[PDB]
Design a protein around this nucleic acid. Structure first.
Ligand SMILES: C[NH+](C)c1cc(NC(=O)CNC(C)(C)C)c(O)c2c1C[C@H]1C[C@H]3[C@H]([NH+](C)C)C(O)=C(C(N)=O)C(=O)[C@@]3(O)C(O)=C1C2=O
Ligand SMILES: [Mg+2]
Ligand SMILES: [Mg+2]
Ligand SMILES: [Mg+2]
Ligand SMILES: [Mg+2]
Ligand SMILES: [Mg+2]
Ligand SMILES: [Mg+2]
Ligand SMILES: [Mg+2]
Ligand SMILES: [Mg+2]
Ligand SMILES: [Mg+2]
Ligand SMILES: [Mg+2]
Ligand SMILES: [Mg+2]
Ligand SMILES: [Mg+2]
Ligand SMILES: [Mg+2]
Ligand SMILES: [Mg+2]
Ligand SMILES: [Mg+2]
Ligand SMILES: [Mg+2]
Ligand SMILES: [Mg+2]
Ligand SMILES: [Mg+2]
Ligand SMILES: [Mg+2]
Ligand SMILES: [Mg+2]
Ligand SMILES: [Mg+2]
Ligand SMILES: [Mg+2]
Ligand SMILES: [Mg+2]
Ligand SMILES: [Mg+2]
Ligand SMILES: [Mg+2]
Ligand SMILES: [Mg+2]
Ligand SMILES: [Mg+2]
Ligand SMILES: [Mg+2]
Ligand SMILES: [Zn+2]
Lengths: 60, 157, 206
RNA sequence: AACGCGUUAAGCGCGCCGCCUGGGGAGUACGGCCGCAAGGCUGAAACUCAAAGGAAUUGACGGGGGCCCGCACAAGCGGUGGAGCAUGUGGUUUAAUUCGAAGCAACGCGAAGAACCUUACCAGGCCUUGACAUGCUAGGGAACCCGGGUGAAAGCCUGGGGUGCCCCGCGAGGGGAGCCCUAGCACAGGUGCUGCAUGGCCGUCGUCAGCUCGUGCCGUGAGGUGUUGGGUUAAGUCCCGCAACGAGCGCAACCCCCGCCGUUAGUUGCCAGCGGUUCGGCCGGGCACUCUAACGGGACUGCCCGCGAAAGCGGGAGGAAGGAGGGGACGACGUCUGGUCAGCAUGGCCCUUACGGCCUGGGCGACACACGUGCUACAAUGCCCACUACAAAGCGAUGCCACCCGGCAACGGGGAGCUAAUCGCAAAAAGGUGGGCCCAGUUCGGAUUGGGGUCUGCAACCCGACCCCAUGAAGCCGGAAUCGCUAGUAAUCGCGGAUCAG
């Protein structure tokens, strides 16, 4: 998250290959789940508040 | 309902694997300046939890005092440890001359005038119940000729 | 850093999710992104009202933003004046059916995140670090809670040596699932930095 | 002082003696005295340090002991270290090879996806209220949308289309909100620093049985007791004892998975009997059982002989399960000033026409080496070509792609089904049947090369994966050292998901 570098990935690019996601909540595109638009740090951090519906804590 | 000064506090060390651990200790007086007076010594994890506790022990550890015109009935001396405590009556106008800790305890117990010295070892705590004992042991011109003589009392008086 | 978040443990065991919907793979990604705007604006403003738990139930493009809060008439204003200013400022961000309610935090000591806040405030407020935390807890077994515990955790009192503190009382048993405990993360800001705070309350075994 | 003394006093008193007066210097010097001598006796100071000490407490520690446990060692299986390749890493090199991780507890770890992008790095072409926020003042501009020129792209010079909304007004048209440009100012922004100024979250000793408080008891106290001893326990689990009695955070249970069974349920799953059958649960019909998810039942040392004050323990009966049945989530007070300012958050130091910003290309992949992790091997319990069976879990309507045709093939073309128990990835593979190889650097092995193609993609030279042909390297089971696992585990064999065009 260099501020302007959330933006180099927000707007649409010269060619379609450059289409890399990022986190809405912090702007680390290093490990991101295109199902949460979120990363692993976030996904827990949040899931740990129950702010993501149906996201349970797992065990078997 | 008891007015209560405070004598001394300290932090003491235990130990353990990885860093020390502690506990704090609080020397506390009590006393309706006309007669009575207690002392406590309180240990506890956080400070004023102790200072509060030390106040407890003092309520039970009470010593009525023979008092006589705000002063001490006879002379007196007592040892306890290697800390040697002196008292001695002073006249109207000479007043709580005594270092740090008898002052605290004598005042609150109710003395106007008194003379005083401390001896050898000076550690508060000894000189504390040095004097708690010095005072447990004061004796009165009547408590007395009715300790002795009083074999056949009320023939004498 | 050894242990686990209490709420995120009882996820449908002795708690509940705030945002309670359904969603498809298409929708959940965007749909949730929305809630984290709803809950960014809603928060940022409502602060000095004492906002607690923010429900966001959902039907077919009908959002259902409930709100638990200390002080319902600093959400309101006079009459119904300032609640309207927002109720659309959300439909201004959604682009849809914001039903933004209000629900008072009845007993305020008996709900953690508040408890956390006022303390983190009191630290911002340059108060007596210890006593803050003592009285913090104090009031919690004074309002009638089963267990209390507050964890002040910074460069405390203005010191260069970073430590931590706390106290507690009563049952604090976070290894019992069947014990309902509320976590409060606050996060004071003082001239020397930033000093996160915690607060756990037990209400009862079920 | 405490240790301990304790009618053998270190208890309570009388007499007399000698002796001490802070550590070092120092049992030295000076002087006298004694002895043959070695030396002794008597015995200082100058200077220098804030101590030198005494008992005692909690810990830590011992090449001190006593008693328990962990795949800690042994008893057993299989590997690494050697070989080639894959991946991190050390060192070198570099215009830069961006960063951080550091004994176990850094090393297929941040990367659950580096061709530009990511990208902090380097070389060039550039932007200056800036890719971004809420604004202020002066002046022009509706917003906005289309084209050319120069160019590696950015960037810059420039042609045109457009002139809505609010208030006043008959009107030209001025005022206003938005947004737009030019100049200036607030300021933006920084993956600049310090994890040893923090938050939080993580690792770890450690799922080890430990860590503590209250009231009281005991010491002048730090402190002890409790928690210890004996029995028992995966445990501070519990039984008995005790100056203790209980509680708080741990253990444990309540949550999930798997094991048996019952209640509600019969679709897109299921087929034991009956009807029809294009022989395909295909259709009628049924929901029996398998499955399918939701809730409940059940295991308690309850029963028996034995052992035992008891807790417990050993063997058994019944039971699907037996002493917690297997597995998961679950990590106590604290330590290592352990980890990261490189997710985010923030004190502070630091730049702000430059570290900030945009861009095309180059780089994290370089290679005299070294380690750390894994893959495939070195083959006969095997390699290979056919025919032949038996899985669970997950993904997919911007995708999964049954079949059909073309091609030796990757794949291309055409195209039916599927919001997914209905359709598809889908071939499960070791196993089975049948046959080929016959100890060979081999039909073992599958490197590294020569050429030919397919695909994703603006774009495969750096620097991709896959197809076919030809090349057929090291290595015949591995030095000293060293790793994992106690049962459906170890080994061995296949499937899947996330990330992501590839
Ligand atoms: C080198 N020393 C003087 C040092 C200095 C600092 N910080 C500073 O000097 C900063 N001081 C300021 C405030 C800027 C004036 C330091 O901050 C540190 C250290 C020590 C290191 C030691 C590290 C070590 N290994 C990993 C290199 C290590 O083995 C351990 C360990 N115990 O296992 C560490 O703790 C270590 O990683 C570490 O933390 C250190 C420092 O933090
Ligand atoms: Mg930042
Ligand atoms: Mg991409
Ligand atoms: Mg003496
Ligand atoms: Mg002295
Ligand atoms: Mg004796
Ligand atoms: Mg001297
Ligand atoms: Mg062995
Ligand atoms: Mg750094
Ligand atoms: Mg690049
Ligand atoms: Mg640290
Ligand atoms: Mg470091
Ligand atoms: Mg450090
Ligand atoms: Mg255990
Ligand atoms: Mg005592
Ligand atoms: Mg007991
Ligand atoms: Mg203990
Ligand atoms: Mg004991
Ligand atoms: Mg217990
Ligand atoms: Mg049917
Ligand atoms: Mg039939
Ligand atoms: Mg547990
Ligand atoms: Mg270390
Ligand atoms: Mg790398
Ligand atoms: Mg064909
Ligand atoms: Mg095809
Ligand atoms: Mg051979
Ligand atoms: Mg084991
Ligand atoms: Mg696989
Ligand atoms: Zn993220």
């Amino acid at each position: 998250a260099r501020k302007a570098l959330i933006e180099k990935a927000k707007r649409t690019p010269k060619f379609k290959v450059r289409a890399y996601t990022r986190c809405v909540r912090c702007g680390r595109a290093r490990s991101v789940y295109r199902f949460f638009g979120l990363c692993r740090i976030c996904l827990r951090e949040l899931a740990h508040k129950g702010q993501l519906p149906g996201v349970r804590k797992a065990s078997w | 309902d008891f007015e209560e000064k405070m004598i001394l506090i300290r932090r003491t060390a235990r130990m353990q694997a990885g860093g020390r651990r502690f506990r704090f200790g609080a020397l506390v007086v009590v006393g309706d300046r006309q007669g009575r007076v207690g002392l406590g010594f309180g240990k506890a994890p956080e400070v004023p939890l102790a200072v509060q506790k030390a106040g407890y022990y003092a309520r039970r550890n009470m010593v009525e005092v023979p008092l006589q015109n705000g002063t001490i009935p006879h002379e007196i001396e007592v040892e306890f440890g290697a800390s040697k405590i002196v008292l001695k009556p002073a006249a109207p106008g000479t007043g709580v001359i005594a270092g740090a800790v008898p002052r605290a305890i004598l005042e609150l117990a109710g003395v106007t005038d008194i003379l005083t010295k401390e001896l050898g070892s000076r550690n508060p705590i000894n000189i504390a119940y040095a004097t708690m004992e010095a005072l447990r042991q004061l004796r009165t011109k009547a408590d007395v000729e009715r300790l002795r003589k009083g074999e056949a009392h009320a023939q004498a008086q | 850093g050894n242990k686990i978040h209490p709420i995120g443990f009882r996820l449908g065991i002795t708690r509940d999710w705030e945002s309670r919907w359904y969603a498809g793979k298409k929708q959940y990604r965007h749909l949730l992104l929305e809630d984290q705007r709803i809950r960014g604006l809603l928060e940022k403003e409502l602060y000095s009202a004492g906002l607690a738990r923010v429900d966001i139930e959902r039907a077919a493009d009908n959002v259902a933003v409930t709100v638990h809060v200390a002080k319902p008439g600093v959400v309101i204003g006079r009459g119904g004046e300032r609640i309207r200013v927002l109720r659309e400022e959300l439909a201004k961000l959604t682009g849809k059916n914001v039903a933004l309610n209000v629900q008072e935090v009845q007993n305020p000591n008996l709900s953690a995140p508040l408890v956390a806040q006022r303390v983190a405030e009191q630290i911002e407020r340059r108060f007596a670090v210890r006593r803050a935390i003592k009285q913090a807890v104090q009031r919690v077994m004074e309002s009638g809670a089963k267990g209390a515990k507050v964890i002040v955790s910074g460069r405390i009192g203005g010191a260069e040596q970073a430590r931590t503190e706390w106290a507690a009382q009563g049952r604090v048993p976070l290894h019992t699932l069947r014990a309902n405990i509320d976590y409060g993360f606050a996060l004071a800001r003082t001239t020397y930095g930033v000093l996160g705070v915690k607060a756990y309350i037990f209400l009862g075994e079920v």
